[PDB]
Amino acid sequence: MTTFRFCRDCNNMLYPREDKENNRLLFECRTCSYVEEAGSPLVYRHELITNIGETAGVVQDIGSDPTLPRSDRECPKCHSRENVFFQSQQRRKDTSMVLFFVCLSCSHIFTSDQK
C-alpha cells in the first residue's frame, strides 16, 4: 500500500509471489521476467474509514483567497494573531465540524480540537 511496485526494466508493475524454496516474498514483472528481493511484510491493505488529519491540499498562497474567513487565534509556533480557518474538505454526512486553522506566516497548520 506504500507504493505500487514498478519494474525497473521496462515500465510494467510487479505482482507478488512466494519464494517457498527460500520461503520468501518476491515481486515478479512476469512480462520480462524480472525478480528482485522484494522485502516487505505488507502485501495489501484496505482502509474502511477516512481519518481527520488529512486537512486539505494546503496549496501555497492560501491567504490570497478572500473568501476564507480570518480569525485571531494564536499560532502555536510563531504566536501570530492572524490566520485563516476552514472546515474539513472530506465530503460526507459523518464528518465532524472541527475547524482547521492555517497560519499565513510560518506556514503552520493547527486544529481547534480541544477535546
Partner 1 sequence: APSPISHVAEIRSALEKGSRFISTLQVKLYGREGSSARTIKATLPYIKQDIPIVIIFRALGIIPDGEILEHICYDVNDWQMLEMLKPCVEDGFVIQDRETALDFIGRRGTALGIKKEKRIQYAKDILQKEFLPHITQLEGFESRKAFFLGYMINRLLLCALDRKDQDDRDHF
Partner 2 sequence: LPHFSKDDYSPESKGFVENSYLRGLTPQEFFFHAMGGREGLIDTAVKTAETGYIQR
Annotated binding site: 7, 10, 29, 32, 75, 78, 103, 106
* φ, ψ for residue 88, nearest 5 deg: -65, 135
Q: Which of residues 5-64 bind partner 1 (CB under 8 A)?
A: 6-7, 10-13, 31, 46-47, 50
In whole angstroms, the minimum distance from the beta carbon of 95 to partner 2 comes to: 12
Q: How far is the CB of 86 from partner 2 (least distance, A)?
A: 5
Q: Record the cell numbers describing residue 23, joined without a space.
A: 520461503
- Residue 67 CA to residue 71 CA, distance in Å, equals 13
Q: Residue 52 carries which side chain, given as an amino acid letter?
A: I
Residues 60 and 110: their CA atoms lie apart, in Å, by: 16
Indicate the annotated binding residues for Zn(2+).
Answer: 7, 10, 29, 32, 75, 78, 103, 106
Q: Is 4 in the site for partner 1 (CB under 8 A)?
A: yes
Nearest to 86 by CA among 105, 72, 67: 67
Residues near partner 1, by CB under 8 A? 1-4, 6-7, 10-13, 31, 46-47, 50, 89-92
